[PDB]
Symmetry: D2
Subunit: 119 residues, 4 copies
């Protein structure tokens, strides 16, 4: 149930394909909704999850560089798919920016995102 369009709370959109081999490929759109705000996502998911009501572990990365903008940063999301009635991807993320060694201590933001298939 991972393949599809997912929306976070903040209004970002993640279009993903889950391949039989464990590969995630797709696009992440920061909230705007134009070509300029689309970035390649790659990831991995558990292709053989536990049959006991456990969620499916997954993760993906976006480098914030496309043909229009380079933020010299990358976010990774680490999380799990929950195939509920209204399914959800619950994640925590790390956004690392490229820095000098002096600013390396303040390079990494952390947060959390919930995604649904409902805008």
């Amino acid at each position: 149930g991972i393949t599809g369009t997912w929306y976070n709370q903040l209004g970002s959109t993640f279009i993903v394909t889950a391949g039989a081999d464990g590969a995630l490929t797709g696009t992440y759109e920061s909230a705007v909704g134009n070509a300029e705000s689309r970035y390649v996502l790659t990831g991995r998911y558990d292709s053989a999850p536990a049959t006991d009501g456990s969620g499916t572990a997954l993760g993906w990365t976006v480098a914030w560089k496309n043909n229009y903008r380079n933020a010299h940063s990358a976010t990774t999301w680490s999380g799990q798919y929950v195939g509920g009635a209204e399914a959800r991807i619950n994640t925590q993320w790390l956004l690392t920016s490229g820095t000098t060694e002096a600013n390396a201590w303040k390079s990494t933001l952390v947060g959390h995102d919930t995604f649904t298939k409902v805008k």
Copy 2:
């Protein structure tokens, strides 16, 4: 300088290719060193980093499932390459395990890894 074999402190080995398009592909080996402990890694890196001594932002994901073992979990690393003399990848990571909703609060470990090209 990202393409190559990298070793973490704990003795894990990351073989990676950095493609011109921002793609990372490769294998992550938990410390053992046999076929059974090899897992596909996919990621993204900043292909056009800042020319001011800033590091290169990157991230990658391993789902802990191969032909031999499934830990029903995924780690993402978020970090930066520093093209020093002895170059390094400084990361923080999140390891999410597939869980029940009741155990979802204790699903995610966080830590940090430094990688070098020197065993």
Copy 3:
């Protein structure tokens, strides 16, 4: 507005006093609601927050040891108070368990809690 009883989503209860000097003192109750599940909390908050609609930065620690139970672990919450109509404390937390050096890599859980004054 920090002084009071706050409830997280999971059903834990935080009773806190915010002193004029920046001190937080109080008790954290894991969801049960008896004397056996009460632990001392200590923390700090910004006593002079920005007058521009910014939240108030705060943090606190619970060592999971009382007269009844010792989990040999400590959680810290780092967050901000938002004096809305229905006010909230938005936090992320780290739960570190005492471990051997060999298990030090898996010592630290991370997550997030929202607290309200409404059960």
Copy 4:
């Protein structure tokens, strides 16, 4: 062995008292070394740690406000004391800044600190 002066890699200094009741009190000095860069720290530690070579779980908070400067932010450290020969406190930390709801997603930095009793 927690009571004493501890130095992080970056050159910050933590003077702490570990009380019999689980309380940490003290001062955190960002790297400078003058009165202007001293801040109150409060925390908790496991007063009865495991007798099996496990570290002692601890955590503390500094609100970045003193009589001289207010950064409208708070750091929490979550970690463990390891009573080695050369003892160490291994931590991960969260630095939350007070923000608007719009900037709440980028409010929280994460990192790691190792402390020793050796400058």
